[PDB]
Amino acid sequence: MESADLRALAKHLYDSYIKSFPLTKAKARAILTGKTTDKSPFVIYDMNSLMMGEDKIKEVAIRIFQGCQFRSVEAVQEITEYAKSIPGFVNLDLNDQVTLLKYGVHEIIYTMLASLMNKDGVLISEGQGFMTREFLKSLRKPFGDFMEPKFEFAVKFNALELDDSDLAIFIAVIILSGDRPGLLNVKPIEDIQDNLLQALELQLKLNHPESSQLFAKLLQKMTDLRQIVTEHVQLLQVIKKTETDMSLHPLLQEIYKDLY
Amino acid sequence: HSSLTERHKILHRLLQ
Ligand SMILES: COc1ccc(S(=O)(=O)n2cc(CCC(=O)O)c3cc(OC)ccc32)cc1
């Protein structure tokens, strides 16, 4: 692929990204910065503010867990629509398409969650709410450990200042990972990823002349995302082993079943 | 011998 083709690929992905994900980083940061004509998000900072704000957005910890799970389920659907737009993806063996989503969806979720985060909290419900980092961390033992690792990642990731156009290609790169366990036919997948990484390299050079080695920095984050999944899974294990009325949504259940 | 599509009914459905 030569530059013109790489640029066309980047725009193709950006447009499908815009059609697949309702809340972009652009909108999100505008809200976070207060640089929108929109009314400021409702702030959830405790149990009272949560119950109270449930008009635009069991025990508290579990209500928050269920809200997050509802959102994850919707995010998986959005990511699946995006994947199907990546040139070459739907021509792959259907079983490999399933594998790539199975492993890729949570990594993408955390990537996009960063767009919604600052060091103080996170936008929820289409950006209509803002749940504080401190509040989440105060959740009783098991539950207070879930979001914090994502905040820590987001703070460092957000320092790279990527925009939606950069992110479109990055997310495609992550989806087209040829080393997912159980792939039937790696070559076609790695071929596509090769094109995407080329498009990403060019995108970052053009869009961020100031960030020397940004490509290299961003590549290292792909591996950070994998560790986040590992830790998250271990925490889900504790919820499974020692919790009351705790059950995952069937889509989440099939994603986590025999994951690694 | 159960394929990926066979053990991920929802994802398979989403992909269709
Ligand atoms: C606001 O939107 C989101 C979307 C995703 C996430 S998440 O960090 O991935 N995350 C996922 C789950 C359970 C469901 C799953 O395993 O997918 C979860 C539960 C929590 O309990 C308090 C906290 C964060 C959680 C956070 C916010």
Question: Could you characterize what this model shows?
Answer:
The complex is a heterodimer of chains A (260) and B (16). Chain A has 260 residues and is mainly alpha-helical. Chain A has one domain (1-260): Retinoid X Receptor, CATH 1.10.565.10. Chain A contains twelve helices and four strands. A four-stranded mixed β-sheet of chain A has the order 1-4-3-2. In chain A, α1 (3-20) packs across α10, α5 (94-115) crosses α8 and α9 (164-175) runs antiparallel to α10 (186-207). The relative contact order of chain A is 0.15. Chain B has 16 residues and is mainly alpha-helical. Helices cover 69% and strands 0% of the residues of chain B. The interface between A and B is medium-sized, with 20 and 11 residues. The site of ligand ET1 has 17 residues of chain A, from α4, α5 and β3. The PDB classes it as transcription.
Oligomer: heterodimer
Largest sheet of chain A: 4 strands, mixed
Let me know the largest β-sheet of chain B: none
Instruction: Tell me the fraction of residues in β-strands of chain A, as a range.
Output: 5-15%
Number of helices of chain A: 12
Using only C-alpha atoms, the radius of gyration of chain A works out to: 19 Å
Helix and strand sequence of chain A:
HHEHHHEEEHHHHHHH
Give the structural class of chain A: mainly alpha
Please state the overall shape of chain A, judged from the principal axes of the Cα atoms.
globular
CATH architecture designation of chain A: Orthogonal Bundle
Distance between the termini of chain B: 22 Å
> What is the class of chain A in the CATH system?
Mainly Alpha
Query: Treating each run of at least 4 consecutive H or I residues as one helix, how many helices of chain B?
Result: 2
Tell me which ligands are bound.
Answer: the ligand COc1ccc(S(=O)(=O)n2cc(CCC(=O)O)c3cc(OC)ccc32)cc1
Name the CATH superfamily classification of chain A. Retinoid X Receptor
